[PDB]
Structure 1
Amino acid sequence: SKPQPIAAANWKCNGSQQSLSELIDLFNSTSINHDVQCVVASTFVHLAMTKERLSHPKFVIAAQNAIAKSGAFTGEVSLPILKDFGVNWIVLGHSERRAYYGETNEIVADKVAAAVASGFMVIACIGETLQERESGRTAVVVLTQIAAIAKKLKKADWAKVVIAYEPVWAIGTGKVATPQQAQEAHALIRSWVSSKIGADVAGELRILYGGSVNGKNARTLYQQRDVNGFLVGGASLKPEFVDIIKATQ
């Protein structure tokens, strides 16, 4: 099966003009032989330079967050502005936003619906914490997270959605996630989609692993039947990202 995989770089709140230009030079000189969607999500400030310097056709740029409408919201950026600016991809509901910025399942769901409605390709993040994992609550939590989003879309909307599974429980907790655990979580997600939305949708849906990925463990990870790529953190700001992209063949 395997739908087209995605290798998304989440630069988070980082980068210098010098540092990012160098990485982008690296990326533009990289030979990519397979069918893969590479995505670079830089901070808002760097969207301009990225759009101008990244010429590799296998790459697309995306934003790391947004609000649904323009208006009196000092400091924020809305979908319309992004769209006007030529951005067609966006990452929403990232664990960091859910944890530090008050984004609940419902707000995340509203942002996604708005994004899809506006023509964006969306990378919607989901994942359970240590506590929820240890109490055997993974299925309940993740499925609830996904149901929220689903509640707002039409079957056809799924074509623009990408699900990113973040093992929040394994991030900064001292716990290590295994490729098997990742696969288990992805399968649970896909099964749900198949049963609640449709097998056609489920068969085409890309589900990315958003845990700790590096050049060393990426291939092992992509090998699993339900892993369709990665939403990478730290490694994405390094040349090693190329290795990660290569691991999706």
Structure 2
Amino acid sequence: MSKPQPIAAANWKCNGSQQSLSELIDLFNSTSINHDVQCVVASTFVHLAMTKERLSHPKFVIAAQNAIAKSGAFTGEVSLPILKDFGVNWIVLGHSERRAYYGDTNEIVADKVAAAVASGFMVIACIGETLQERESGRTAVVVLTQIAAIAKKLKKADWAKVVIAYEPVWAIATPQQAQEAHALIRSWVSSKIGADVAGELRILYGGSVNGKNARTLYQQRDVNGFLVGGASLKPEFVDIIKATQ
């Protein structure tokens, strides 16, 4: 019957000092986790070296927060082959802040997801609708077109490397609202890709999660874990991880 393995993802965004991040990682390290869950830490590019070195908990992997597809004349950017050479195997793509501020269009996110999949990354691909879009009743068409763009560049086998993160930008929500969004995504994948892909697909909730609402949210049928913002910079991330049983 089972839910696939849950994922607890820490998106630190553009935050942290060597000091403050190093303490948090010690805290994760000293954390006892007794179930099957993949914990993910996405730090800035700058802190990948210290994270890779200091995070030893065997249930954790490190991720990047963005990349471009190829090395070359792209001053300021980091590419997939550079990340792969550095030993980073997870990446967050298409986060709402990048779609909003940094020109991650539906198609550009799709190209990045496909390039990351093809060089072997595990990819957390973010989709989600704004406030205006939800109130207009355009959630399904906005959100499904986002994933459909990503799907156009994937084959069936690729979905084993893909995790979807639903970001309800419009609340920046009830378990019912989250559940219906996830069910909406899963139903799309079943109809458009196949039931053999959709049952296994992790769909993560990426709205504001804290230690107190996480449990009720994870109990939803189609919620497979979390992509956490601000609370991932704090000790309460550990309680979010624990909400995933």
TM range (shorter): over 0.9
- C-alpha separation between the residues in 1 aligned to 2:118 and 2:171? 33
User: 5+ residue gaps in structure 2?
Assistant: none
**2:240 corresponds to 1:247:** no
Offset at 1:149?
0.2
- C-alpha separation between the residues in 2 aligned to 1:198 and 1:99? 31
Of residues 198, 204, 226 in structure 1, which corresponds to 2:200? 204
Mapping of residues 1-249 of structure 1, within 5 Å: 1-171=2-172, 177-249=173-245
Offset at 1:35?
0.1
- C-alpha separation between the residues in 2 aligned to 1:135 and 1:167? 15
- C-alpha separation between the residues in 2 aligned to 1:25 and 1:139? 41
1:219 aligned counterpart, secondary structure? helix
User: 5+ residue gaps in structure 1?
Assistant: 172-176
Residues 61-101 of structure 1 show CA distances to partners (whole Å, capped at 9, x for unaligned) of: 00000000000000000000000000000000000000001
2:66 aligned counterpart, secondary structure? coil
Q: Structure 1 length as normaliser, TM-score?
A: 0.98
Residues 165-188 of structure 1 show CA distances to partners (whole Å, capped at 9, x for unaligned) of: 0000111xxxxx111100000000
2:52 aligned counterpart, secondary structure? helix
1:61 aligned counterpart, secondary structure? strand
Offset at 1:231?
0.2
1:12 aligned counterpart, secondary structure? coil
- C-alpha separation between the residues in 2 aligned to 1:220 and 1:57? 26
User: Alignment identity in percent?
Assistant: 100
Residues 14-41 of structure 1 show CA distances to partners (whole Å, capped at 9, x for unaligned) of: 0000000100000011100000000000
Offset at 1:124?
0.1
Residues 33-57 of structure 1 show CA distances to partners (whole Å, capped at 9, x for unaligned) of: 0000000000000000000000000
Offset at 1:8?
0.2
- C-alpha separation between the residues in 1 aligned to 2:104 and 2:19? 32
Offset at 1:200?
1.2
Offset at 1:102?
1.1
- C-alpha separation between the residues in 2 aligned to 1:170 and 1:112? 26
1:226 aligned counterpart, secondary structure? coil
- C-alpha separation between the residues in 2 aligned to 1:146 and 1:51? 31
Structure 1 runs of 4+ with >2 Å offset: none
Offset at 1:193?
0.4
Offset at 1:198?
0.8
- C-alpha separation between the residues in 1 aligned to 2:158 and 2:57? 28
Residues 199-229 of structure 1 show CA distances to partners (whole Å, capped at 9, x for unaligned) of: 1110100000000000010000000000000
- C-alpha separation between the residues in 1 aligned to 2:34 and 2:199? 24
2:199 aligned counterpart, secondary structure? helix
Offset at 1:103?
1.1
Residues 128-184 of structure 1 show CA distances to partners (whole Å, capped at 9, x for unaligned) of: 01111000000001110010000000100000000000000111xxxxx11110000
